[PDB]
Design an enzyme around this catalytic site. Structure first.
Site, PDB file in Angstrom:
ATOM      1  N   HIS A  34      -0.673  -6.586  -5.608  1.00 51.69           N
ATOM      2  CA  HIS A  34      -0.476  -7.756  -6.454  1.00 51.69           C
ATOM      3  C   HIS A  34       0.993  -8.149  -6.686  1.00 51.69           C
ATOM      4  O   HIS A  34       1.244  -9.245  -7.183  1.00 51.69           O
ATOM      5  CB  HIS A  34      -1.247  -7.653  -7.782  1.00 51.69           C
ATOM      6  CG  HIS A  34      -0.655  -6.696  -8.771  1.00 51.69           C
ATOM      7  ND1 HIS A  34      -1.023  -5.366  -8.826  1.00 51.69           N
ATOM      8  CD2 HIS A  34       0.244  -6.880  -9.765  1.00 51.69           C
ATOM      9  CE1 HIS A  34      -0.358  -4.770  -9.802  1.00 51.69           C
ATOM     10  NE2 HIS A  34       0.424  -5.661 -10.380  1.00 51.69           N
ATOM     11  N   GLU A  58      -5.467  -2.366  -3.737  1.00 47.96           N
ATOM     12  CA  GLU A  58      -4.134  -2.550  -4.342  1.00 47.96           C
ATOM     13  C   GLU A  58      -3.002  -1.750  -3.713  1.00 47.96           C
ATOM     14  O   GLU A  58      -1.891  -1.755  -4.205  1.00 47.96           O
ATOM     15  CB  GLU A  58      -4.137  -2.419  -5.870  1.00 47.96           C
ATOM     16  CG  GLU A  58      -4.707  -3.625  -6.597  1.00 47.96           C
ATOM     17  CD  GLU A  58      -3.903  -4.900  -6.365  1.00 47.96           C
ATOM     18  OE1 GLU A  58      -2.705  -4.923  -6.722  1.00 47.96           O
ATOM     19  OE2 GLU A  58      -4.463  -5.883  -5.829  1.00 47.96           O
ATOM     20  N   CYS A 137       5.506  -2.324 -11.537  1.00 51.20           N
ATOM     21  CA  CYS A 137       4.531  -2.055 -10.467  1.00 51.20           C
ATOM     22  C   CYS A 137       5.196  -1.870  -9.120  1.00 51.20           C
ATOM     23  O   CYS A 137       6.182  -2.530  -8.798  1.00 51.20           O
ATOM     24  CB  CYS A 137       3.424  -3.090 -10.367  1.00 51.20           C
ATOM     25  SG  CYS A 137       2.373  -3.056 -11.833  1.00 51.20           S
TER      26      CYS A 137
END
Length: 172
Positions: A34, A58, A137
């Site tokens: 993402h 992911e 992230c």
């Protein structure tokens, strides 16, 4: 100390999209799906046709035809770590600050996060903000095995308290 990992290992952590990624070797780059920029024709100046891209649950891996970080040695990328292991998340902040966060990892599972299917491992941030933030992230989860460092996932999510974190891991 107090940053645990050597400068070369920190230098693998790389600002990317809306987060970070990690150079596993001179040609292999990993990150959380993402955070990857969309609608682009190249990454790090290289056209898509010169990059083998695999994405699932992911976890995203790029393999460049061209050596992009020939200053690095190749590291082992494992599918998560054994449960119960204390691992570290190598967090860089936009300020430049380095923050190796200790985490104890639990079970590898398929989870549904904010509508995304995550193949990953939960963990607990260890008692010593203190934790991760939304811009983190893609930061790598690592641990040292014998004399070598190993990478086993990339930061993907955290609960509202921040006490529980999840890394995405590569499926076998």
């Amino acid at each position: 100390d107090d940053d645990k990992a050597p400068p070369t290992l920190w230098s693998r952590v790389t600002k990317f999209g809306s987060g970070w990624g990690f150079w596993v070797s001179p040609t292999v780059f990993i990150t959380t799906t993402h955070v990857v920029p969309t609608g682009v024709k190249e990454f790090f100046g290289e056209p898509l046709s010169s990059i083998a891209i695999h994405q699932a649950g992911e976890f995203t891996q790029f393999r460049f035809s061209k050596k992009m970080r020939p200053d690095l040695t190749g590291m082992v990328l494992e599918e998560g770590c054994p449960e119960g292991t204390v691992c570290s998340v190598l967090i860089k902040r936009d300020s430049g600050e380095l923050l190796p966060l200790a985490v104890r990892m639990g079970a590898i599972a398929s989870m549904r996060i904010q509508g995304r299917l995550v193949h990953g491992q939960s963990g607990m941030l260890l008692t010593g903000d203190l934790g991760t933030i939304p811009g983190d992230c893609g930061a790598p989860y690592v641990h040292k095995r014998g004399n070598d460092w190993v990478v086993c996932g990339v930061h993907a999510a955290a609960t509202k308290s921040g006490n529980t974190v999840v890394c995405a891991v590569q499926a076998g």
